[PDB]
Amino acid sequence: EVMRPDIVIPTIDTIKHEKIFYDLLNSKRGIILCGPPGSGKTMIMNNALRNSSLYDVVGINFSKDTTTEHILSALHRHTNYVTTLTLLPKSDIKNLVLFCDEINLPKLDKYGSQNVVLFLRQLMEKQGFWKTPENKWVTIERIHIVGACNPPTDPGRIPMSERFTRHAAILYLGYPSGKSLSQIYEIYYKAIFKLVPEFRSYTEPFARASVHLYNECKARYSTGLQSHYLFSPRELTRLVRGVYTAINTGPRQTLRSLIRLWAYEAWRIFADRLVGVKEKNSFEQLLYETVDKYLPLGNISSTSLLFSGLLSLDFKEVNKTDLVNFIEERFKTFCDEELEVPMVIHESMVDHILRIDRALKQVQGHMMLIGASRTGKTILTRFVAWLNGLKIVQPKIHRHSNLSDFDMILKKAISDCSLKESRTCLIIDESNILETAFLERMNTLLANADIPDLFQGEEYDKLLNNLRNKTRSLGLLLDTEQELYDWFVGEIAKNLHVVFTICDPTNNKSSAMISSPALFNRCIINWMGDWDTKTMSQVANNMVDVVPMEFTDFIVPEVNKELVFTEPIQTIRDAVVNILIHFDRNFYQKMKVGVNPRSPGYFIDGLRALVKLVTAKYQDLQENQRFVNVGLEKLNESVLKVNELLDRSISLVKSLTFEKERWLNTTKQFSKTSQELIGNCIISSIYETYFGHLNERERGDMLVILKRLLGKFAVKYDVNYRFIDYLVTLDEKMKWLECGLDKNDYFLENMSIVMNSQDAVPFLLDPSSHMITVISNYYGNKTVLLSFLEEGFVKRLENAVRFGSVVIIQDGEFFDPIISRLISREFNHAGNRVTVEIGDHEVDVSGDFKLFIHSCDPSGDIPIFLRSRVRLVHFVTNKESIETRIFDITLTEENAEMQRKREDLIKLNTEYRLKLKNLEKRLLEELNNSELMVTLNNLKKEAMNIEKKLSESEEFFPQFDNLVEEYSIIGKHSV
Amino acid sequence: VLKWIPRNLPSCLINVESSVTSVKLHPNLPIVFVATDHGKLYAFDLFNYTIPLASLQSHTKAITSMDVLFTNYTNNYLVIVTASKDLQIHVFKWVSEECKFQQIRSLLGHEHIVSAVKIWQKNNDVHIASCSRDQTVKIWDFHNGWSLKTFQPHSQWVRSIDVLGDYIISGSHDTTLRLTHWPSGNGLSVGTGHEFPIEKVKFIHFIEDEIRFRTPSTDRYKNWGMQYCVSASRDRTIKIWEIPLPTLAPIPNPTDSNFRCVLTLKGHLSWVRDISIRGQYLFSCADDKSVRCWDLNTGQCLHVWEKLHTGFVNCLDLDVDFDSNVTPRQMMVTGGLDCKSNVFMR
Amino acid sequence: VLKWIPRNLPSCLINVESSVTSVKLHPNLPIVFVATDHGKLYAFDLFNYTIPLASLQSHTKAITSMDVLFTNYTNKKNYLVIVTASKDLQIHVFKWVSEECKFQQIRSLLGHEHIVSAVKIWQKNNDVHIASCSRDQTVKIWDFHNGWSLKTFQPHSQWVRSIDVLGDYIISGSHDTTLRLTHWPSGNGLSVGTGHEFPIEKVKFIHFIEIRFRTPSTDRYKNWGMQYCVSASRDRTIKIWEIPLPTLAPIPSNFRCVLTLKGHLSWVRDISIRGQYLFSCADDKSVRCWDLNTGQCLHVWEKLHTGFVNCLDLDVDFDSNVTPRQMMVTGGLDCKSNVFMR
């Protein structure tokens, strides 16, 4: 009977308040019950009106934006319109009580008035209202208006007009005393411990411990720290319910098992919403001292209490290693079956999976996950729903969407939950609530067990037809309206779980989402927040322990214990993980995040880029060293054979002196290049994944920070390291310069960044819109230009995905959330076929499809989804670009032939340098792939000809230097 | 010869390159065939298990299931078919002279990954059943190489099938069972009562040696030739079903188009992967690193093989006892995700 | 089982790019790992020898030696550990990912001052250590987990050509004709032994089996667990020594030659003992099999390779977790390998 919410312990205050409320209600007077949340206004009302066979309760929860039409809609299924107009209730023997909860919540207009409050004043004073369609007067006959509201001193509560409160008697309800709460939960704990009769003497100490913990956490964790630190006796009721569930669905219990079970429930009810780690430590010490004081046992940290039924038939504490292995195998099956995503399982992920599972296994168990973006909220929710047999439903709310789409989605979900009894987990992001009307609809859905205005009129009648058909399908014997609708709301409460995903709790819309009354009092708040440094250490180690990293000598640095986040440093891998974590922390600190959550997506992207880049670089270095060593060995063997023992062979041997000395120099430099490989790969990954949205000065400052961090942990790196000299080759650079790039180092770096993002789509922020034509020139005629503002963009994008062309979507600040599957790369694989779900029907990905997003408006509105899941790159005009463009224009307008000759000479010289490099590579390959003498003589002659051509072509550079020195003044004045 | 129970310890420990997905027993010679998640197909002797006899990589993707057939003719070789994730069913040949796998042909026709196959000989003609992720269950012809009939019995993709002559029951991902008469290609009955996707479903073939669930109840069921079915799902449960008799191509009775759970076995700690029937027992394996043995008469797990593998347990099988052409030898082989194969002998 | 006699004809012919130097067998799978003079590590499936399972340019020069070990952790997933010793003054530690059939480089061991010539891997209850020796006259022993060196000593004036590890005792064969048993955790020698006139090629211990040389004599030898060993050199002679019991940190005194074998026509390269039988090849393109009891050759294997025969591997039969497979693999100078199964 603990699960039944109609159970009330009769105390002195309870029976007194119930009797006075009933006596006031029988006097035909309005009643406004005042008091802090969790006082028990609704409780004493339900207790008073439950035993009466002549009153009925109608429950409306008022939101910030509540209108009269909501009250009318919530009453049309309970009342009738009879012209005797008169709004009589449907029942002829029982009156109707219109419970209007949170009256203080509907907002004031521009002129300081409330529509709902004035409507209720009209209801109780004039006993009627005016009906808007046909302009007629109705007369309320047997409806009593009873309200419940918090004191106006609470934030979010506004003062009420005295013209409305004059007609309503007011009863205040404070919190019960600590002795009273101890007695109440002592009765609940006796009821629970009837399941375990051999610990029947511990009911009172457990209740005293729980009430003491509640009082202490209310004293410590008040509203002044965070807005969501609102504690109530409802928290103790939730703790009692969780204790009963974990006892009933568990094995035979002992004292240590009971204490740890209760402490786990206390962690999940009270400390789940805590933000700071200091508050977590305070709660840990509070639990320690409470158990020591009242319950005279192992470690009681959050990670050490892992109670789950995923491994057995009972809810019991399980080991971390076997749980991690089980979750890994189940997630492998999930990635094979439903959605393929390469994410790493860690201890915090395991704990969050356990608590989401605990929330979803409840009845009417809704959850509100709060944390940074790319933390793993929606995938964890979908995985837990898949483990529990739920059906995931994500509303495809996009741009150019209205109330009708969301109402249809909610109606379909409700119909599936009730008619088709399909248990459904609904994921609602903060970006799926476009307007406050959606939030009000969801608040009404959570507060009640349906939405009333979605079923009105002929829609209501056809809903009755469908439910009657389904009820005769099950053979249940019920005929009246009330029993059928009770079945409806019970089925919705049983078979629907709502999950809220919030990425920026500081946002005003998300703040209203959190501070909503029904969302706060029903959902289980989970403040995951950002990743603590232990979790980042775990995931970084788990995804870099599969690469060649330890191939050089490593002297362990002597650093502070507080500056090491991993295990004590013994290898290069731990140093790399600590370096990356330190740079992530320093980057988030120096970008002035404030108290906003910090998304770990940059860390994960940097890790993956480092993995693939160090794998490729190590393979290339090993191959090059093998080639140069076998080439030197072959040259030595040929020289020895010639000495032991023909003019062409002698000339070929004598003509490879420069090649021999270059090869010897490379073999000498192999050790130095192998020592500094890991640091170069780290800095390259940081450039790829961190520095996209930075100017040159911020990039230099962050590079200085990264270099001093990288030298702190005794990791070597190239002193003259450069991104262009490392990631940009001559082939790529010449292709870009033929495509139309500028001669800027910054623009070349950004082009290398956008052309190496094979995982996440690149976001181009180019105000001049030159990169549109640049990338159109790169892919030739296969490039297609789409926009988010044009009709028919969906079908064009689907056709381009089916064909496999390269798509550039303009206006990136008007992001359309239908392509969230394309941005997050949540593809599905059908053998050799890769399909993605765009809009409502899945389409086939050809594999040559590429996505670019462009936006020419700086300081635009980029959603945190797109912002976290793309490689955003800025394209700004720096000083060097100004000087170069000004010089090019003035040289074209001064001596056009000179400028044409100069640009042709530069293109020719760099083309010959590329040809010389390719010739050297071909020479090495042909030497290692052993007629041939003539081929190598021709190669040597071609190389000599190219060298002579460059020597002749370098006779005009001082004139260009004199020209740029002459025009530097106009360049600097222009900038 | 029928009430044999395997010992506490396995007779041998066969090591395979990666996760073992399916294992099959040769009905005639003591040799076991082991599939592989890497796509390989091994063949290990029952007495010299250190080295394989023949193995080859035919699929580029993971093998999902396989079965063998010792063909007999009234006018004589072992046929190995193998489903995989490559949308293909490769048919092999087992020559006993030099113990080498001989590839016969590759069977195509599925638009998605194929899960289960079944092979049987009917009057000197052999047919190959198949079910895939494209919601299509098919029965093909080995000699002709072409398809014979294709139909879609389930709203979600089908995961396992089993054939009793011309009747096939096909469990699927939509938590339901359906019996379809293959030559007519129409559904007959539905099995509802599971809440999680069906892992493997198979018939309860009759025996004459008393077992409660392997005997006919009425003369009409004996004339039909099938009465019961067993299905294992992800609900950690093994359910025994009862097939209602249709109007006898059979015509489904509208008021008798639903199954009836005769018995529901419970006690597994995770997804029940594979099931098998020997005599009065129901050998089953699950993801709890355990193998049960449920007595069919009493519905109790008489023996539990706790921690047989250190990982998941995928597949097992016994010798078919309802067929007089195969001697029901007392050998059991069990594979799992631990990249190991355990064989129980004597 | 343990009395298997190899067949006359080779069964598998494995082709590589260069001369095979070291061959090691997978202790649980029919997979052969082949190392070449080009440094390319080759993993060849036995039933598909036309193409390798996985190939990797592990070292930039010739690989000199190789060893494998399958870990058995009491708590942690077990995996195969592969080490390679080459002329790059470095040692690479690999891991065979049999899930995908790829080579995963875990870590590298650096510190040897010239080319590494031999390695040896062994496992304690939860500790794995890696030994090595090289031309700079030292025997360096590393740690598999941490990666840094744990012991460094010079046992010989000349440069050690081969080592073997049995727990806390190391025996080193060098270019000089002598050997020395060195205690591992204290780094002090225990006994030496001379008698050869040519540089020593390969030296390894002899383990007891529950036989002339695999049966302990007295209880004091049972407590130590070591009585004999095997070594061979370019003398075309394989000799069995007797290990004197030191004054037990043990305190050290000569090796008693109890058996000598003659019949090889050139310098031998490898030594392997399979129960009652001893296997050894040489540069005479022949593999000679020797009985332990009689001490005389039983079968010969002529003309397997046109060039020299480099290495042999036979599975360890004194280990509980290692099954004694009836198999052996040999490598040759002619870019060819031979596999004998069943």
Ligand SMILES: Nc1ncnc2c1ncn2[C@@H]1O[C@H](COP(=O)(O)OP(=O)(O)O)[C@@H](O)[C@H]1O
């Ligand atoms: N006998 C009792 N006396 C006082 N409070 C009680 C008693 N029984 C239960 N409660 C508490 O009253 C709470 C119900 O409060 P509720 O009516 O939801 O507050 P509100 O009026 O703000 O909605 C329950 O969570 C329960 O802990």
Ligand SMILES: Nc1ncnc2c1ncn2[C@@H]1O[C@H](COP(=O)(O)OP(=O)(O)O)[C@@H](O)[C@H]1O
């Ligand atoms: N434990 C993890 N290991 C590796 N990557 C992770 C992990 N958790 C999340 N991610 C990254 O986050 C992405 C999915 O999380 P996401 O759904 O973006 O979080 P949110 O719900 O806050 O938007 C994946 O692309 C993945 O790369």
